[model samples]
Target: SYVPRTEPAPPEHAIKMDSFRDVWMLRGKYVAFVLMGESFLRSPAFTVPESAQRWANQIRQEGEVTE
Candidate 1:
């Protein structure tokens, strides 16, 4: 069966946001991950290098506040 499909119209105003995903783009042995850029929903299966891990950890810690 063949059916035609149409894309929805775009909104008039531009979109903005406060919170966002921490994305990771991996190609072979190279992996790039950062905050407020993009997924951490599942196990990435790749071991995070020391540098990236520490940076990510700091971001997480900074988000936490102590009363």
Candidate 2:
């Protein structure tokens, strides 16, 4: 079905915050799991690599984000 626009129209200055998933892209893998990224949620069968896991844990202990 097709519908024509008839409303007065939305506000010209309306703003919306970027969704969590978008923000997830900016987040490091460490926090991604804690924060629950899409890949982690959609695919539990996948295995996290040892290096990545170590980095994730290290991030939790310290505020280190990049190496």
Candidate 3:
């Protein structure tokens, strides 16, 4: 028999394994992000799929932030 120190959890929960809720895992998927730092360093968001760029662009544009 085997015992694990911690129970298995969703990847997002694992990624956000902290008390701060500032970070979020988009759409219950692998994408994770946090709002912090300067404008230049704030971006070039990362995601597994490039197609999600459309949404990213929309978000960036909403705040009048450019890459």
Candidate 4:
């Protein structure tokens, strides 16, 4: 039996940060692997197209997040 996933109550104030996967969405892809938005953890490799990979690297280079 499958129990449907539940949506939890919204927080009074949602936390905000320079989100990585948000950057990823515009600049990343998945290939039978897992990529996370809010947390950093992993296994198989994720993707960043030739353009986005560099751009995302720029995202890192600009230094909100360092490489």
Candidate 5:
């Protein structure tokens, strides 16, 4: 099946349009985040883990971001 559209995509999506280079930034970040979540869940809920805390702290300390 084929549907042809006749409009240019937005300027902001230029980075997305270049699927090779800039998209890797997101790929790396997305790839990195999953490991923390899986290992963090392997331990008990009652006891707070240090590595889990350090992971949280690292993300927190790195924050100067405003959405």
Candidate 6:
């Protein structure tokens, strides 16, 4: 017999964005969310579907978090 796996619960503060730009625009707020264990679903914000992962790559390349 095979056993099924269960999915985990949603984070306390989960918000989905429309695009990479939206993520970038609101980086200040959402960035903290990310740092604080928030989930950011970017399924709707990938303008370039062919290169969906590029958005993240750009963000990493463009900025460095400071204290």
TM-score of each: 0.29, 0.26, 0.23, 0.24, 0.23, 0.23
- Please write out the lDDT profile of model 6 over residues 1-67, one tens digit for every residue: 1211112224423233345332332222332111212334333333343343444445344532421
List runs of model 3 lying over 4 Å from the truth.
Answer: 1-48, 64-67
Off by over 4 Å in 4: 1-48, 64-67
- The Cα local distance difference test for each model comes to 0.31, 0.29, 0.36, 0.30, 0.26, 0.32
Model 4 root-mean-square deviation: 13.3
Tell me the lDDT of model 1 at 55. Answer: 51
Q: What is the C-alpha RMSD of each candidate to the true structure, in Å?
A: 15.5, 15.9, 12.6, 13.3, 16.3, 12.1
lDDT of 3 by residue, 1-67 (tens): 1322122346444354243232223334433232223232122334443333444444455644544
Error of 1 at 41 (Å): 12
Q: Give candidate 6's TM-score.
A: 0.23
Ranking the candidates on lDDT from highest down gives 3, 6, 1, 4, 2, 5
TM-score winner, 1 or 3: 1
Give me the overall lDDT of model 1. 0.31
What lDDT tens digits, residue by residue, belong to model 2 across residues 1-67? Answer: 1221112224311111233221122112211233122122111211333444455444444535644
- What is the per-residue lDDT of model 4 for residues 1-67, given as tens digits with 9 covering 90 to 100? 2322112225312111234432222213321111233222222224533443444344444633445
Work out candidate 2's RMSD over C-alphas.
15.9
lDDT tens readout by residue for model 1, 1-67 = 1211112225311111122232232332212233332332212314444444445555555632311
Most accurate candidate by lDDT: 3
- Model 4, position 8, has a per-residue lDDT of 24
Candidate of highest TM-score: 1
Go through the candidates in order and give the clash count of each: 2, 0, 0, 0, 0, 2
Q: State the displacement of the C-alpha of residue 38, model 1, in Å, after optimal TM-score superposition.
A: 11
